């Protein structure tokens, strides 16, 4: 039927990049699964923040939580868990039919503990046990401290959405941590066939940083390269996926860790709104799209087959050309990681402020 269905036939599952209570009550979340072929969802603090400030969708539970003695942290916890568990129920049919790959709902641990392995693990177990739904996924970022918490968590049978992956180097480390996670899960007696993971690899961020730097260079050639690095970087990640899982020896029954294209909303009005979907389509992948990007794909389409599998030559040429023009790609990826963690933590404080505003 739809262009999202065509995208799944190419191998790329479509997830939605937020779980606002607006979507649930309105019936939008059912509609999006049923009509837009959405087969997974993730939490979104920034959107959550906004919804409490500008909307009445949480008014009922805020009244509840203000009636009890709820702190800002407890309110935020309670509200997001109720959303997530509600989404888990509704995605149960897809979870069961998809061999556990899709039908997933992701929820993060506290962004402020992301350099703290122990605390990240502790809160991963806590969230896992509290939500108490087998299709939930705990978002754990691929940043210092929490990267090894990824294998610890998988070792306990927790399914993990790895987030804040910006570079192929760090993606390689994420895959290694997944393989060790599943090896330890087996050694700890867990049925490894029910442990899943996705690796959320950011796309638009790269072009935002690099488009600026290409404009600073200002040459014809630099300007002609704009809007290419994000796709190219992701395609290089896909080659790595194939490489490391080819080389890997996983316990029997183990799932693959599918690459997931995140931040796939275009940030420049001149770029086609389907750029980070059509160019990143192919086997064993997920794309976590903003709903506006889902609607762009649905009405505009512009898919042209699998654009991932045979993509490595093109993508490398983009990167070798960027480095010929003097763009310091290692510095770019370091800026993205630092800015990534700060944005991550910042949007969390934005949510805590929003929340505090309502609880007074």
Automatic annotation (TrEMBL):
Subcellular compartments: Cytoplasm
Q: Please list the GO biological process terms of this entry.
A: carbohydrate metabolic process; pentose-phosphate shunt
Q: Give the primary localization class.
A: cytoplasm
Kindly give the InterPro entries that the UniProt entry links to this protein. Answer: Aldolase_TIM, TAL/FSA, Transaldolase_2, Transaldolase_AS
What EC number(s) has UniProt assigned to this enzyme? 2.2.1.2
Q: In which pathway does it act?
A: Carbohydrate degradation; pentose phosphate pathway; D-glyceraldehyde 3-phosphate and beta-D-fructose 6-phosphate from D-ribose 5-phosphate and D-xylulose 5-phosphate (non-oxidative stage): step 2/3
Which keywords has UniProt assigned to this entry? Cytoplasm, Pentose shunt, Schiff base, Transferase
- The catalytic site is made up of 139
Taxonomy, superkingdom:
Bacteria
Q: By its UniProt entry, which Gene3D superfamilies does this protein fall under?
A: Aldolase class I (3.20.20.70)
The UniProt record lists the keyword Cytoplasm: yes
Stored PROSITE patterns: TRANSALDOLASE_1 (PS01054)
Gene Ontology molecular function: any one: transaldolase activity
State the family named in the UniProt similarity comment for this chain. Answer: Belongs to the transaldolase family. Type 2 subfamily.
- Known PANTHER family for this protein? TRANSALDOLASE
What protein name is recorded for this chain? Transaldolase
Organism for this UniProt entry: Corynebacterium glutamicum (strain ATCC 13032 / DSM 20300 / JCM 1318 / BCRC 11384 / CCUG 27702 / LMG 3730 / NBRC 12168 / NCIMB 10025 / NRRL B-2784 / 534)
Specify the taxonomic lineage: Bacteria, Bacillati, Actinomycetota, Actinomycetes, Mycobacteriales
Gene coding for it: tal
